[PDB]
Ligand binder design. Structure first.
Ligand SMILES: Nc1ncnc2c1ncn2[C@@H]1O[C@H](COP(=O)(O)OP(=O)(O)OP(=O)(O)O)[C@@H](O)[C@H]1O
Ligand SMILES: [Mg+2]
Lengths: 302, 77
DNA sequence: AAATAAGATCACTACTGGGCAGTACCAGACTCGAACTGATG
């Protein structure tokens, strides 16, 4: 059914929290971006970069998980005979402690996530970490991943140099050129500081269709909330958009905070003050809106 | 968490350190990593765990040791 | 333009993985000196 199971009420509160924490709503933007990404992955058109943007809270990471699972289950019939054929590899970029992005650490973490043995015993067979670089190139050629996801790709820009900001990506460019591995760099709007471009747009209040979609996802969130009495939430859609700006990801964790607080008190419904207790700060939303406005203005070029 | 700690080992409820004002003009991330590792692991029984770094390991007395040769991202890992 | 930063390079120091030319053993196995023995013209 479209609603949450009614048998979880007798179950302990931890079970209800675990059930709600794993519910991933398929809003139209998420599935549209998923279809675009799947179409790009299936036929790359000779491209080697699938840059994807979106302010924090759009749902990029869950989109990555969905694409990972879908590609793994799509390949599943053919890995029974073919081994060393990991379908998709997804890693998260490291924020450098120094002023410049570290590429040795990136190479070693990419090798670790591929379960490549003997990383400490690599050799260079005739740049940063040539041995690790060649090892990662060979691992990508032979393991043959369909896509190489790099979440938090905005940390690649930590170089503090205009003449090196674009050149910091030469390592990934050369690694994708000579191994033929699709690199899908998921990042926030900082990634626009620099190839297929995908936009994970939020639900801007100017367009009524986005308002309708936000109310739809809000209603389907309220339906799946495990309380004895279904809490009315669509009435304060204006409030739920003020502290969220239209991102379906931070709405989910806001509702998670409120639901956990309700369950810990053995409550039965959600009121306005419950949401106010675990709402985002007034200044936090202002900073988020400033950053998203800068990103939208950067991407507004036609 | 004490009943859960008794039931299940290899579990710390809360870990806490204090940031250090640096003697130099920049914050020391290597010291932060090594002191967080010391605080997290030293007040534990010898529960054999292998971190994915060559240098860092336990000793006979149980006190964790980090070589000065260990590079900071390895400590972070 | 002079002054102040900062990365690059050379040089030295301390630390910690860690392998190659070489020896030794133990029966299983193959090949053929040397001989043994029977059929034959
Ligand atoms: N559509 C969704 N439905 C349900 N939960 C979601 C959804 N999108 C994100 N989440 C939840 O949000 C968390 C992951 O962060 P989220 O996807 O919101 O941020 P992101 O903007 O994609 O990532 P980041 O800010 O790190 O780049 C998880 O707890 C996940 O369950
Ligand atoms: Mg994320």
């Amino acid at each position: 059914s479209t609603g949450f199971p009614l048998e979880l009420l007798t179950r302990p509160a931890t079970e209800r929290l675990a059930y709600f924490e794993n519910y991933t709503v398929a809003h139209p933007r998420l599935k549209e971006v998923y279809e675009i990404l799947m179409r790009t992955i299936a036929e790359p058109a000779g491209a080697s970069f699938i840059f994807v943007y979106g302010a924090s809270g759009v749902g990029k990471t869950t989109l990555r998980l969905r694409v990972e699972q879908k590609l793994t289950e799509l390949a599943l019939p053919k890995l029974e005979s073919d081994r060393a054929r990991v379908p998709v590899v997804g890693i998260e970029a490291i924020a450098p402690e120094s002023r410049y992005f570290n590429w040795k650490e990136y190479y070693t973490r990419a090798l670790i996530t591929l379960e490549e043995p003997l990383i400490d015993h690599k050799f260079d067979y005739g740049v940063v970490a040539p041995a690790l670089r060649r090892a990662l190139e060979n691992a990508l050629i032979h393991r043959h991943p369909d896509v190489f996801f790099v979440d938090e790709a905005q940390h690649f820009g930590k170089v503090a140099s205009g003449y090196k900001l674009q050149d910091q990506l030469d390592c990934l460019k050369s690694l994708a050129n000579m191994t033929g591995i699709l690199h899908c760099l998921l990042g926030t709007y900082e990634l626009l500081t620099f190839s297929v471009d995908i936009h994970f747009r939020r639900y801007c209040a100017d367009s009524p269709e986005d308002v309708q979609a936000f109310k739809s996802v809000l209603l389907t969130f309220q339906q799946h909330l495990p309380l004895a009495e279904t809490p009315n939430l669509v009435d304060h859609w204006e409030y739920f958009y003020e502290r969220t700006l239209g991102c379906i990801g931070t709405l989910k964790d806001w509702l998670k905070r409120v639901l956990s607080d309700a369950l810990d008190r053995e409550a039965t419904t959600i009121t306005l003050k419950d949401l106010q207790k675990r709402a985002l700060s007034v200044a936090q939303c202002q900073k988020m809106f400033k950053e998203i406005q800068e990103g939208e203005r950067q991407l507004s070029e036609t | 968490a004490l009943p859960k700690l008794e039931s299940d080992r290899a579990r710390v409820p809360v870990v806490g350190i204090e940031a250090i004002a640096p003697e130099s003009r920049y914050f020391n991330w290597k010291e932060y990593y090594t002191r967080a590792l010391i605080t997290l692991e030293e007040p534990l029984i010898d529960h054999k765990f292998d971190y994915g770094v060559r240098g860092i390991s336990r000793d006979n007395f149980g006190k964790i040791n980090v070589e000065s040769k260990v590079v900071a991202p390895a400590l972070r890992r």
